[PDB]
Design an enzyme around this catalytic site. Sequence first.
Site, short mmCIF file in Angstrom:
data_model
loop_
_atom_site.label_atom_id
_atom_site.label_comp_id
_atom_site.label_asym_id
_atom_site.label_seq_id
_atom_site.Cartn_x
_atom_site.Cartn_y
_atom_site.Cartn_z
N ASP A 97 1.04 13.61 15.32
CA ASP A 97 1.21 13.75 13.88
C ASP A 97 -0.15 13.71 13.17
O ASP A 97 -0.32 13.05 12.15
CB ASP A 97 2.15 12.66 13.37
N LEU A 149 0.82 -1.21 0.00
CA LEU A 149 0.00 0.00 0.00
C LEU A 149 0.86 1.26 0.00
O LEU A 149 0.43 2.31 -0.48
CB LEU A 149 -0.93 0.03 1.21
N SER A 196 5.04 2.99 1.62
CA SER A 196 6.13 2.97 2.58
C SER A 196 6.66 4.38 2.80
O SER A 196 6.42 5.28 2.01
CB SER A 196 7.26 2.05 2.13
N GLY A 221 8.54 6.81 6.37
CA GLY A 221 9.12 6.86 7.71
C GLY A 221 8.48 5.86 8.65
O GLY A 221 9.13 5.32 9.53
N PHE A 222 7.19 5.61 8.44
CA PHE A 222 6.44 4.64 9.23
C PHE A 222 6.82 3.18 8.99
O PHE A 222 6.42 2.30 9.76
CB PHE A 222 4.93 4.83 8.96
N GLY A 223 7.56 2.90 7.92
CA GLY A 223 7.89 1.52 7.53
C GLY A 223 7.25 1.18 6.19
O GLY A 223 7.11 2.05 5.34
N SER A 224 6.88 -0.09 6.01
CA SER A 224 6.21 -0.53 4.80
C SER A 224 4.90 -1.20 5.19
O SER A 224 4.88 -2.05 6.08
CB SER A 224 7.08 -1.52 4.01
N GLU A 260 -6.46 -3.02 11.57
CA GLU A 260 -7.72 -2.98 10.82
C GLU A 260 -7.51 -2.29 9.50
O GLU A 260 -6.69 -1.37 9.40
CB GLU A 260 -8.80 -2.20 11.57
#
Length: 273
Positions: free
Chosen positions: A135, A12, A14, A16-19, A89
Amino acid sequence: PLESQYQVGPLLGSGGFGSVYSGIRVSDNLPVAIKHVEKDRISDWGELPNGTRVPMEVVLLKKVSSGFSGVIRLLDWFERPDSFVLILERPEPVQDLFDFITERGALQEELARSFFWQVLEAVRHCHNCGVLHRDIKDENILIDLNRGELKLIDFGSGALLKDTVYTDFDGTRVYSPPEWIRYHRYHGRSAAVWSLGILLYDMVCGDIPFEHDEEIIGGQVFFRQRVSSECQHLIRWCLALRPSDRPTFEEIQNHPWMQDVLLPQETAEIHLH
């Protein structure tokens, strides 16, 4: 085991939050989002009651994931040798608010009111749970397009809510308050209210009010689009340069602009279906 229990789908996105990947829970085909973040890339760590070292986002998510709310709930998580994986979710169909605004432009005030109102309730929920998100912005808000419900995502910059000063911040700068810009100091609730002012302006104008630090600390709010006097007033209030001059969440929700909000379902019927 992780991948016996979940069928992974497309990436979906990627950052700073990751992938983050689309997925489905195999035991009942529940739609989920699967977020991978490398341990190396994890700044903040906390721990669960049983003293397990986990990312802070896990602690904060557990705290806000009890009950139904306007927050995407953490369903499960796994530790890997060099990453953590979170099962979250996934509304379907879903579009994030940044995407939604980019696509459709400035929102009708009725739609902005319903959305802004639901964000306030979700933020009140977080704060009741002792969680400060830090954020809040269009990109961190998912729209359930059929139910007309908004859900907060990404507690990766969040913290435990406290009444003393915050001297750290790794959220989005242009949503960050002038006291942070010039002092590297903010208090949680008033900084949240600032970001909400930024968000409300974004919704009804189709873009954020400030780009550069200089504009943020000047805090002069110019309206590029036609916006109602009551809405302008609430926005300018949320964006008061002195944090103590900003409204409480109660004052926001009691503002004249916030009266007669649509229910989520009728929001979707009128504006999203």
